[PDB]
Structure 1
Amino acid sequence: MFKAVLFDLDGVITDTAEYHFRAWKALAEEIGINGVDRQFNEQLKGVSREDSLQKILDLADKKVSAEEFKELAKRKNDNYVKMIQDVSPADVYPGILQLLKDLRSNKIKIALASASKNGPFLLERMNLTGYFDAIADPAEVAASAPAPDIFIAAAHAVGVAPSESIGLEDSQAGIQAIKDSGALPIGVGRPEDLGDDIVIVPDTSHYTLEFLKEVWLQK
């Protein structure tokens, strides 16, 4: 049986996307750039902070210095950190707490394998820290998804090889990271986005211990 589950955070445990969107929209309003609406924001999903800021500047053909650019990115981050202050246990996605409980009951290791530099804070706000055996630090990896680094780190931190692990992700690059780590990916979303060569569930209510066991045994 698999010995660990490596959890992405955003799109798996909870959603932070609304806060990212509102942070960008607030910054755009402050600097007088029109057009940062919900539809535009779809172009910022899975994109780096810096590439997202550039997309926003491009809406107004705005040119800035490196120092100005750094400051705008900082202001967006400040916005986001303020906006996540009221995250709560009610924000945990369906099924996830029961999955954590069932994994713990069955002595299966639980690691956070998230790109979020706010992972520990968010798990505290959601009252989930006690379930986690480790949090891989995204500040300590050399490369971000689709590189496998955070998933290798997470597996190692709970004393397992990635090959003994399942990874859960909502992003295409994240799925590729899991695959390349050696862990077994189970995506949440649709194959158009994630690929058709992995098991995918439509939403997190399908992430149950019984389902993960079924997937593992099929493999």
Structure 2
Amino acid sequence: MFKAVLFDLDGVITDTAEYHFRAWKALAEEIGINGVDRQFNEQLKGVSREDSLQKILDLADKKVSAEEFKELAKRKNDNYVKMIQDVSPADVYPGILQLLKDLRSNKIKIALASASKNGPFLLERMNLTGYFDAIADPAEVAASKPAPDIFIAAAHAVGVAPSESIGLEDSQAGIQAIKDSGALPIGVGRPEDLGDDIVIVPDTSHYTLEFLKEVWLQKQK
């Protein structure tokens, strides 16, 4: 049986992938870059703050000083943080709270593997901090998803090897990071977007301890 579950936050626990998209959209248009639409946002999901800006910059081949780069990243975050002030326990996606309770009840470790530095604020505002045995600190992990670093760190932070872990993700980059880490990905979204080679659920209500066990087992074979 798997010994840990590594949670993405934005788009898995709550509807904050939407707000990241809005805020990034707003930053691009401000600096004159027009192609950050929903289809392009699929490449930004799971991607770290600085790396997300660089994708946006590359879209227009725009080049900026190191100082302006830092300033744009701060401006997007100041905006995003203003967007997420209403988040509360009411915004926790379906299945998630029960899943955390069941994981804690069955002594399965729970770790956050969110690239977001706003992760801890959101878990507290959603009154979920108590469920998390560990949070991987994006300030500590060298490389943004699709690099596995964050999922490796989360597994280790709860004393578990990635091969004994499930990762829950809504993004292409995060799913690749799970695979490359050795953990077992279970995606939430459209198969069109996240790939029909892995187990994809239409929404988080499908994420249940028993569903995770079925997946796991079927994997073992």
Q: With structure 1 as the length reference, what TM-score do the two structures score?
A: 0.85
SS at match of 2:55: helix
Between the aligned partners of 1:171 and 1:40, the Cα distance in structure 2 is 12
Change (3 A) 1:77 1:192: same
SS at match of 1:24: helix
Q: CA deviation at 1:19?
A: 2.2
Greater shift in the superposed pair: 47-56 or 88-97: 47-56
How far does the alpha carbon of each residue in 1:63-109 deviate from its partner, in whole angstroms, 9 at most, with x for none? 75442333222111111122222211111101100010111111111
Between the aligned partners of 2:176 and 2:213, the Cα distance in structure 1 is 21
Greater shift in the superposed pair: 14-23 or 109-118: 14-23
Between the aligned partners of 2:56 and 2:173, the Cα distance in structure 1 is 22
The 5-angstrom pairing of residues 1-219 of structure 1 reads: 1-24=1-24, 26-27=26-27, 45=45, 49-50=49-50, 53=53, 64-217=64-217, 219=221
Unmatched 5+ stretches in structure 2: none
Between the aligned partners of 1:47 and 1:136, the Cα distance in structure 2 is 15
Between the aligned partners of 2:71 and 2:83, the Cα distance in structure 1 is 18
Residues 87 and 125 in structure 2, CA contact (< 8 A), matched pair in contact too = yes
Residues 12 and 93 in structure 2, CA contact (< 8 A), matched pair in contact too = yes
Unmatched 5+ stretches in structure 1: none
Larger Rg: 1
Change (3 A) 1:73 1:108: same
Residues 187 and 194 in structure 2, CA contact (< 8 A), matched pair in contact too = yes
Change (3 A) 1:21 1:177: closer
Residues 47 and 144 in structure 2, CA contact (< 8 A), matched pair in contact too = no
SS at match of 1:44: coil
Between the aligned partners of 1:11 and 1:99, the Cα distance in structure 2 is 16
Aligned residues: 219
How far does the alpha carbon of each residue in 1:45-80 deviate from its partner, in whole angstroms, 9 at most, with x for none? 455545655676789997754423332221111111
Change (3 A) 1:51 1:183: closer
Between the aligned partners of 2:47 and 2:32, the Cα distance in structure 1 is 22
Identity of aligned residues (%): 100
Residues 189 and 202 in structure 2, CA contact (< 8 A), matched pair in contact too = yes
Change (3 A) 1:111 1:64: closer
Q: With structure 2 as the length reference, what TM-score do the two structures score?
A: 0.84
Aligned-CA RMSD value: 2.7
Residues 46 and 115 in structure 2, CA contact (< 8 A), matched pair in contact too = no
